[PDB]
Amino acid sequence: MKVANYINGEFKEPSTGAFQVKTSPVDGSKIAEVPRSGREDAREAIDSAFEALKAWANIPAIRRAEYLYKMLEVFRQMKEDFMKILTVEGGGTYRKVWGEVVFTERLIQNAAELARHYQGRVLQSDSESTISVVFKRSKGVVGVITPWNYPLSISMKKIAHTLAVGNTVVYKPASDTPVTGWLIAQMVAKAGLPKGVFNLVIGPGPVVGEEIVTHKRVAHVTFTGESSTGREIAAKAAGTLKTVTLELGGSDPLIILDDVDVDYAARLAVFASLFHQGQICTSAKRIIVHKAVADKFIERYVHYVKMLRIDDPRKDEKVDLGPLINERQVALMKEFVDDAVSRGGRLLIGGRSWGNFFEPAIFVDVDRNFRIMREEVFGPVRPIVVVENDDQAVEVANDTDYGLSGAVLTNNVNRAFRIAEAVESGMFHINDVTFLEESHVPFGGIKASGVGREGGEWSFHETTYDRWVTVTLRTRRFPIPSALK
Amino acid sequence: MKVANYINGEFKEPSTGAFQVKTSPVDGSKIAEVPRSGREDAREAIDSAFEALKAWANIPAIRRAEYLYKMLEVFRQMKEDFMKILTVEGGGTYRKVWGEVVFTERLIQNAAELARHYQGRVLQSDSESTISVVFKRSKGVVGVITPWNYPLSISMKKIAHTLAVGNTVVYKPASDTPVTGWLIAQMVAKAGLPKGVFNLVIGPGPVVGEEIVTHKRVAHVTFTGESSTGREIAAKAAGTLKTVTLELGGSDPLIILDDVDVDYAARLAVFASLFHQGQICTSAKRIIVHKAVADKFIERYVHYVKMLRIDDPRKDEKVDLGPLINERQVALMKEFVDDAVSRGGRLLIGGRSWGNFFEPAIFVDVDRNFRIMREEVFGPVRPIVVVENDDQAVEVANDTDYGLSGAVLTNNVNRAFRIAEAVESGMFHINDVTFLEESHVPFGGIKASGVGREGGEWSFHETTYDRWVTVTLRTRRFPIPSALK
Amino acid sequence: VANYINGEFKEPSTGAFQVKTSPVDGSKIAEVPRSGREDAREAIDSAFEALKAWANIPAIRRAEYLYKMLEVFRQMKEDFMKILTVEGGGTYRKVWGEVVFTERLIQNAAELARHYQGRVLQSDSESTISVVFKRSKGVVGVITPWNYPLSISMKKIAHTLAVGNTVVYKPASDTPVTGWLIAQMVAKAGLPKGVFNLVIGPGPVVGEEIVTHKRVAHVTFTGESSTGREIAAKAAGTLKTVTLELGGSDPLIILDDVDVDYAARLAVFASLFHQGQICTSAKRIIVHKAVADKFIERYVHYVKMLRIDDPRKDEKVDLGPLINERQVALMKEFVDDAVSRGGRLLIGGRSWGNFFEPAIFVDVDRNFRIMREEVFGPVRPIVVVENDDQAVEVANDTDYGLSGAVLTNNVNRAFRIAEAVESGMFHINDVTFLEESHVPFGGIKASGVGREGGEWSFHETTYDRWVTVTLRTRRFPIPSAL
Amino acid sequence: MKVANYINGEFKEPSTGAFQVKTSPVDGSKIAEVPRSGREDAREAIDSAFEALKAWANIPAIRRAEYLYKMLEVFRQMKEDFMKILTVEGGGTYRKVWGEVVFTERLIQNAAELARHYQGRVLQSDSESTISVVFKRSKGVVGVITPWNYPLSISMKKIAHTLAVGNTVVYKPASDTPVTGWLIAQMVAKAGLPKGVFNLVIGPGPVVGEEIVTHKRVAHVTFTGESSTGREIAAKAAGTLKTVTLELGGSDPLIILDDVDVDYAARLAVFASLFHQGQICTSAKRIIVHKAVADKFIERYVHYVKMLRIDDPRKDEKVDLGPLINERQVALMKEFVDDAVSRGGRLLIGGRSWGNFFEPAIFVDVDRNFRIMREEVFGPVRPIVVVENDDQAVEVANDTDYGLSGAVLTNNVNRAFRIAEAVESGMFHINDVTFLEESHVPFGGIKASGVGREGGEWSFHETTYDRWVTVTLRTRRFPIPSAL
Ligand SMILES: NC(=O)c1ccc[n+]([C@@H]2O[C@H](COP(=O)([O-])OP(=O)(O)OC[C@H]3O[C@@H](n4cnc5c(N)ncnc54)[C@H](OP(=O)(O)O)[C@@H]3O)[C@@H](O)[C@H]2O)c1
Ligand SMILES: NC(=O)c1ccc[n+]([C@@H]2O[C@H](COP(=O)([O-])OP(=O)(O)OC[C@H]3O[C@@H](n4cnc5c(N)ncnc54)[C@H](OP(=O)(O)O)[C@@H]3O)[C@@H](O)[C@H]2O)c1
């Protein structure tokens, strides 16, 4: 299957001539031949975006909204194609790629809905005869760099909202999910957006991504990926004084208190910690349980983990877990497991690997020095930690460099609110999963989980700037030269 | 006179023992002996602010207001001391420092007024039985790094607004204006803020400023200075994934169309372009004139420059201009004049310098390769360009790396608005000077002039983060394990 | 044509019918209900019962129904146009614009439903959480006029539904088939029973029941100011709130530094579109002495180009008839009054059937009826003034205060004049009846209270609810013996 | 001691020449001669206000803020004066009036704080080359009409906030608390406001108030009072199409679930339901408790009600309750106890009354047909209703014509929110008193409890209107005449 870049309105081959084969994580089957673009495909894309910017930003918002609704109609027609690819290229189960596609629809609609309603401000002026307002203005051409785990929805949240509010987009997907990127481009072009407004360039982050980050005609970069990558991207962005949105790692706590429906808490816990093989930035990566319910909770959780069906996600719709994205991740997960075992940890079930599939590894009796407590474990290896009181629940919760999401299960209004207040995270949920997400809410972290927020108006904040503009209606006397009446 | 750091409730001498001497830009006379602090002194300041943070952030906003209102009382009583020191250390005329002092009063008050009123949002949930809201949380320890040209007001806008909304502060004033910084510390202390909440550290930027910028326990740095400096700071800040506010340089365009009162235009142009010796970020640094009034305008502009009185800013109230801040700035103005003469620009007046003083130098017949058209000219050298039409005015206006402020002079509504939305600046003013500033408007630039906004709630946006928080009120079925209903 | 109650088209309990005839030629169009208080009471009761389920589904689900409704409207475009002309007397271009705008209104309501936000506050109390929600008011009365019965009905209806209220709708008696077509659309869109209700009856009966009923929480009204005062007074009884979009007598002010031809072309469209039957019509034209002669000359030149004919005949017809013969008689009274007081009729004034030519007057004074009253028809005065101050004085010399506009290229004159004119809406270098789907539409003085369009429609039909949570116990000041 | 009107910067006697004597609710001793004004007086004030409007509305907000900040200065100096009038004129205890006075300080500061920050909007335009903004404009002269139970704080929340955003004011206090209003005017005048910006007129509501409500040059009326009076005012206001704010009665429910600390619940309940003798719109007027703790709660509640100390509020700072505002109120309360006894209610305590003092009468075993369940009991009579579950609790809670505030005590987050969402009120409070109030939050009710919101920006919403303004920058073509 032949996949190209999308630049300035047309599908074209990389300037470098170089291609690469994308393989399925399921069985290593060849899916598509895809570009390995170089710095100049990037430059061509960026310049294409820059030229298209003036018209795009200056048409009325309602017109951009129409194009997005057009985008939404095409997408609805392309739903199966997207699912099919998210499953086979990305390793997602039916149910996983169903939710991603449903949410993506809601993401695109949301960007459209909001385009006409992003308001500036009329201000009171401290001077007489002065009108003092604030406009919203497009930043310009915006780079969009994304990960492989939820590559469709994460990309569209960035891309659609960026487009809505008058920016042009240069977009480079994760190299592990380039076909999904190509389907996006397909969708954009069947919607008929003007040449240059949206651009796809497939290639390596350190090369294509970096050129995007360091280019002078790029006003802003929005990025989702690892926290180390984020730090380098911020560093490089400083060169041209462009702004950034960094949606980085997470190691989110799921705290269970003792006044819960223990069974329910275990069902929820299993879902939050292990959906998409724990391949989720807002995954319940670290589980924190109250002593009084720990034993029953651990029995039930393991009971339910054991029931998880692992299989070729192409077989049927009821498969619970697919494989990890690549062989490298399986290796990292067996490291995480080994370190725990070696450190005197107790393995309750799983931890085997066959192919790119990894059987969920659940640990108890850990301390703060385990790799699975100090690093983001982006896969199906989870520590359970037992604590004696709420104050201890919060210390374990916050004992991380990360600060993305988090959650607490309880029926006590005070305990819920106190624990919410004390956990150091960008997002928090009382009595739900850690990876709750709506289209228009402010998604983002603190500490090492990143900087800024995305979703609806918050996405608009990121890709626009405030502009103070005034009009003075009465002439005034000026203080210099003091020799004037 | 002897000046000290203010750290953790207490005035103290540098860990390093080292003391520098601060002399007057007016005559070289010794003003005061000031610290030359080290990286050690910065860390002590930072940790103090960290330990004071929790208690300071968690009281109700109305307490924080009461302390700010308290600062306002104290500041009102010191006014003349701030005035004295701005003139004798910064070189500002009476009128200049009077204005800085009045605005600083409004700044302290604006931040106090708004503390209780910085709101979050209650959201419509896409999910049944879900409460979905967004809180405002303070960032934490905020580093405040300021320049020498308007050291009182630029500092206070940052310190007051940052404090109000629940952050703590480590402040490093410009090395050329350390006494102003110390006088601020006096104020804060006289107002009895809790120890550690506010901290002063007088020292070299590349060692004291850098420690602030790279420290772990600092969440945000708000910077005002050169753009080169900004790029540095933004890059080191990336190390700890902290956020920044960069208020960098400007080369703001003053466009004068042909339907104006030409004499008024001149009077405004002079004040805008040359006030405080043109050492103002939002100075009218590049004056752009319609050909139909160019001869008259230039005649008039030069006429009023001639009238500018340059003297000791301590002599009397009616002194138009004082010295530049040091020898280095004079040298720099000399290069600027050299280059422009070297390139065939017609020098109409000024150029004379003695000690730190400098008579304003006006040029015509320039082109876009002149250093005074490509760089920020942070002093009293000013180019005037004649253009033939509105397009041309705009093309020239946007021909710069900077995008801070800007202004157009006309009585025609279409011409004013079409020029306004065509010039690329963070701010813009119609029929007023380029450096309008009210205490609660979004102040800031685009392109190379920086990132973010400061003033009122915009200051608040910079030093807070949004936190999405939810409560789910009905239990749900989860997709895995699919076997289970 | 029938009512729509609790998900059913049904006959009026009174069994009475009345014939709708066409303003264009007097020919019968449809037999429509002539409902009474009982029919209003049933409708009200349906909406009240449907209320709790409809208010409490997520916004995204109400948005879905509206998008569904939007798709149905698109299918019915040519049906809505044909009625707006045959029933309402609108030209092709007039009804097309009404329909396009209605499309955008329906969409706007859907787009905004999910985005109507409350606030989170700083508490002056420690350990206290303090927030504000948005809640539906409940059952909402929607009472409308005949001049733009589609777009006016839908701005109210669509926006009111989106944000969780139920609706009892009552259209003007001169345009009920349009009201009925609306009921059609909602039914084909599949909204839950009771959520939307149509009752076609007389104002002082059906409308008054709606206004005075206990279970109605809010009434949104568009019509004459006298009715607005009736309605507001009767509404007081049950402490329900109202939105009153009332009459206009909008000034169009023309300064001396304008392109006079352009100014004239604009003037004709603003003052005369839909036979002047626009609340935001340029109803009083105000010109600066320095250009008054050429302006009047050009204005007249373009008015005599206007084509008044059967709006059914083709698409380039400029003007149709007035809605009925009372309106023609009243227009005669305005013209007759103006002539009697010594005013100069520049052009026009012929009538026939319900048709009525533009009548243009100059040399008038403030005592002319066409300067004191709303002239909801094609009779228009031009007033010459010597300077800006006088234009403003003349512009403000009215009980009304809906919209208004000034034509000029001088930024100061434009803005100072804007500050000074007393209206809810104002437009610089554009027509007086400027209208977008999401802007705060409404007036001051005698033109009403409140605002419709977008979030403002939501403001009208929601209330703010302050809710708190205290997380620490405290001591209390009584009994002091503790 | 003699009191005057305040019109156009001048303290003047009424046009009628007629005066009246304000006695104390506490012992009946004479307090002041106060005016009985007439329509001519209201008319003069309305005109003064009108004349004063243009200057006041046009100056920049910061200037209005400075005048307010100086009002704050004055009020701070007059604190003890306001306190002692709030007691001798209105019968508040030391603690009640202290709180009203602290809160009033806050309200005035809050008004000043916000004056410069009330923003309009910049809209996206569906047309090309169009600028589209929304301005905030002040309505004009504003009538302010207020009750007697919290005459300082309620008056001042309206007055200051209305003033802050550029309106002018014609203020008429309750005839039972006219001296408080006079002091307000004393304070305005000492702050040096432009003449006619603030006006005080003391007289009967049906004459002075009705004039304010019906006058063509009055733009808006913000009213606090009985719901019935609200209905009258709203009707009369329709004549000139002026807008109103109606802060009417309440009958708030306090719901106590069975998972609480019962003793604390009782302690809270006594404060919420009986503070200022129950003379609070947001008083906990109908108490609703779960069966599993009802016995224990009722005993405890009665225990602390019995401990209450009723006395001359002037004696000292520890008096829990003073008297009702007048003999009429005692009479009404007696009816309420009378009706409850005849309908089969069980009187657990209280009922003794001498002069204007009244001991809190507490009832159980009541039903929905009792007057004290169907009406606002603006005094110290309170029913306690036992329910079997959270459904019944909501059912009883919403069985009113009212819907001002309301509250629930419970440690269960699910029950707490479900209940709050279900109760029909303009304001709700989880685990605090029904009458929580801050300076800047939207205060107001639904149903019979009124229309609109007061407090900070919400006060500003009520006394301003939005103004859509556009600038079009490209000429365009028009559809008539089509021949072109
Ligand atoms: N906060 C959130 O919302 C969120 C959501 C999902 C996932 N995540 C995070 O995403 C991470 C896993 O994704 P990942 O393996 O794809 O992370 P990654 O290795 O950092 O890659 C992210 C993207 O950055 C590109 N990239 C790499 N180096 C670059 C450079 N020097 N300059 C510019 N771009 C560069 C990559 O392109 P290449 O393919 O060429 O490497 C990729 O498209 C996890 O840490 C997870 O927490 C965060
Ligand atoms: N956007 C605005 O609002 C605004 C307003 C006024 C001025 N400005 C700009 O400010 C500039 C003039 O002031 P300036 O010459 O003082 O600017 P600067 O040379 O860049 O230095 C300003 C501050 O940054 C500190 N600094 C220098 N190097 C640093 C480092 N590596 N790390 C941390 N801090 C460091 C300086 O310390 P030392 O003093 O010890 O070197 C000083 O406190 C001009 O560019 C002017 O346009 C901007």
Author numbering:
A (entry chain C), B (entry chain D): 7 to 491
C (entry chain A): 9 to 490
D (entry chain B): 7 to 490
List passages from the publication reporting this PDB structure.
In the present work, we report the structural and functional characterization of the first thermostable archaeal dehydrogenase (AlDHPyr1147). The kinetic data showed that AlDHPyr1147 is strictly specific for NADP+ and is active with aliphatic aldehydes. According to gel filtration, AlDHPyr1147 is a tetramer. The AlDHPyr1147 subunit consists of three domains: the coenzyme-binding domain (residues 1–256, 443–470), the catalytic domain (residues 257–442), and the oligomerization domain (residues 122–144, 470–491).
On the omit-map calculated for the model of the ternary complex without substrate, there were strong positive densities at the same place in the active sites of all six monomers (A, B, C, D, G, and H). Therefore, we interpreted this density as the substrate isobutyraldehyde. The oxygen atom of the substrate forms hydrogen bonds with the O7N atom of the coenzyme and the OG1 atom of Thr230. The isobutyraldehyde molecule is located at the bottom of the substrate channel at a hydrogen-bond distance from the coenzyme. However, it would not be appropriate to consider this structure as a productive enzyme-substrate complex or an intermediate compound since the substrate molecule is located at a too large distance from the catalytic Cys287 (the distance between the substrate and SG of Cys287 is 5.74 Å). The structure of the active site in the ternary complex is similar to that in the Holo-3 model, and NADP+ is fully ordered in the “hydride transfer” conformation. This is the only crystal structure of AlDHPyr1147 in which the occupancy for the nicotinamide ring is 1.0. The Cys287 residue has only one (rather than two) conformation, in which the side chain is directed away from the coenzyme. The other active site residues have the same conformations as in the Holo-3 structure. It can be concluded that substrate binding leads to ordering of the nicotinamide ring and the active site in general. In the ternary complex of AlDHPyr1147, the SG atom of Cys287 in the active conformation is at a hydrogen-bond distance from the peptide nitrogen atom of Thr288, and apparently this hydrogen bond can lead to a decrease in pKa of Cys.
